[PDB]
Amino acid sequence: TKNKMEAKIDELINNDPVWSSQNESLISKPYNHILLKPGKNFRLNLIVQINRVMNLPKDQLAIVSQIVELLHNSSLLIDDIEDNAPLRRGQTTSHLIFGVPSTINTANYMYFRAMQLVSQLTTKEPLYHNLITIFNEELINLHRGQGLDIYWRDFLPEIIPTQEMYLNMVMNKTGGLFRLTLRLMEALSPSSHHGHSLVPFINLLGIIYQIRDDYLNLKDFQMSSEKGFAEDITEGKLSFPIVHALNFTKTKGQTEQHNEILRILLLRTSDKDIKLKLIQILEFDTNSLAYTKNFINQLVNMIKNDNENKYLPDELLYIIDHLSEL
Amino acid sequence: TKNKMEAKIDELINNDPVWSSQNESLISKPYNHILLKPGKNFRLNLIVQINRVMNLPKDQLAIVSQIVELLHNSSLLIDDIEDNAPLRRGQTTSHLIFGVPSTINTANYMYFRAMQLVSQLTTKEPLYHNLITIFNEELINLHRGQGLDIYWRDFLPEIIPTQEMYLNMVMNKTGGLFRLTLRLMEALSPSSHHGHSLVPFINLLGIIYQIRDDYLNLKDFQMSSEKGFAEDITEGKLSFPIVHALNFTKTKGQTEQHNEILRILLLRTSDKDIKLKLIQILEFDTNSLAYTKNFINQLVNMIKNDNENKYLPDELLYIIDHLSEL
Ligand SMILES: [Mg+2]
Ligand SMILES: [Mg+2]
């Protein structure tokens, strides 16, 4: 009917868009799948410990936590598509089960659900503005560092990053979410003057976290063809040890080794022997693994020897030792 | 050195993350590539026309425009990855030149750059909160609609949507950015009482826009194997004409035709002959193209005959006829 048609259309356009709980569940599949991954208690533990200094009431702390989890999980769903990763914590990656399209859309949807939860942290307009700014700033930083990490890898050998370039990329990429969490808590703290800001400390933790992630991905494989897959090699990633090896070989004039490192990265290979060959070049030829192990210990020592509490404000050590499960 | 190392690390963590204009350019490549696509003046046209009623000052209108262009472009970069599209406005899609990883990251980065421009629309804390809420809500709506469109396509034949389901998906998917633009403008209007909200009107524009897009994707191919490629068929899309046909064949018990349409969609084919074959079922068996043409005219009529200005508040007609270049 021309009349019934028009009446139904009129009703449609005069109401909010219709969305059912059934709809909500269908599009949530990729997210529900990655929730089966653990490590959630470790992240919560770091938030709970920082809260000994910030004192956010429990209800508010739970919301900060929900925001953090959504952003962290969304980042991993996108990152696995970006890295072409087959597994995440021993399980099949969501994009391989539900497809790349649904996974990208669900991860992006969850970023906006996280943004929505921010307005539940306060009713004070000045504070709210500040919270959304922190959220906006650090997601911008995360995307900038992720953008460089990806560009270096996909356009190699166009740019061979230096250690400093790598470190600035990580301050953006990994620091983004650490700082996002910490800044929200500091903005919300009802506590008078809980001492100097912990941003430097959280930046340091983000850097130790990333470099250790890079280091263990190779070391675990070197120690066992089944402890890890050294998937970072398959991905062609300009990891901390690889950056050291590429610059070391350049510097010492090891032309053949420089080029062979690049060649293997460019193969995107899953061959275990070829991955082990590159790892042993880093072990014996460039000593990049030892150099990295020592760099990490030095970073950790800047905290463990922080007597004048210039970074620190106990549980510290445990968190640092389990930094890999964040 | 252990001393200098620590010193360089302390400096790094006590500063904001380092990001250069050169870094900014690398990450912007996938985005600058789509900027070579036209239609921007048409979208600006619609904003300019609507501004006759809203009267936002030129500077503020320019920022709304920038926000609109970033969201529109980002959503197109992501959509082409989600639909595996080889071309966008006669040109090679960005993910095919810069890779899916850089394109996803850059598109997401730009959503956040747009979010940042929102805080430059006003300094009034109450209005600002409302602007962010508009931004947040409509982007959530765009992702819900997109998630469902993708779900139906990727899970076909699990769910065959009805016309109403399709129309609710469109209110979310397409209406999201039309409403986002209009709501921002209505929230910012200094103008006293610029008449009833134009949201119902913009909703209708979005529906007409989407159904015409689905319609032309097939009609252009039916009229020329080089005017268009009917990529929607290759994508397996549950487009308006396809939804009508699947339900028309179910309804009349034409079991073989119902199944043949599904088989073609499920092929994900680029074979012109097979695509023409689907088009002829829609033209001769279900008459879905005429039905759709007629449905569109009826929608348009609702505006063309809106004498009591229930939806309208001249350039209306031109806008309606060039709705496809938005
Ligand atoms: Mg990764
Ligand atoms: Mg599309």
Curated annotation (Swiss-Prot), chains A, B:
Cofactor: Mg(2+)
Cellular component terms (Gene Ontology): mitochondrion
Pathway: Isoprenoid biosynthesis; farnesyl diphosphate biosynthesis; farnesyl diphosphate from geranyl diphosphate and isopentenyl diphosphate: step 1/1; Isoprenoid biosynthesis; geranyl diphosphate biosynthesis; geranyl diphosphate from dimethylallyl diphosphate and isopentenyl diphosphate: step 1/1; Isoprenoid biosynthesis; geranylgeranyl diphosphate biosynthesis; geranylgeranyl diphosphate from farnesyl diphosphate and isopentenyl diphosphate: step 1/1
Coiled-coil residue spans: none
Alphabetical list of InterPro entries matching this protein: Isoprenoid_synthase_dom_sf, Polyprenyl_synt, Polyprenyl_synt_CS
Annotated S-S bridges: none
Sites where the protein binds dimethylallyl diphosphate: R88, K173, T174, Q210, N217, K227, K237
Main location: cytoplasm
Additional detail: Present with 2840 molecules/cell in log phase SD medium.
Protein name listed in UniProt: Geranylgeranyl pyrophosphate synthase BTS1
Gene: BTS1
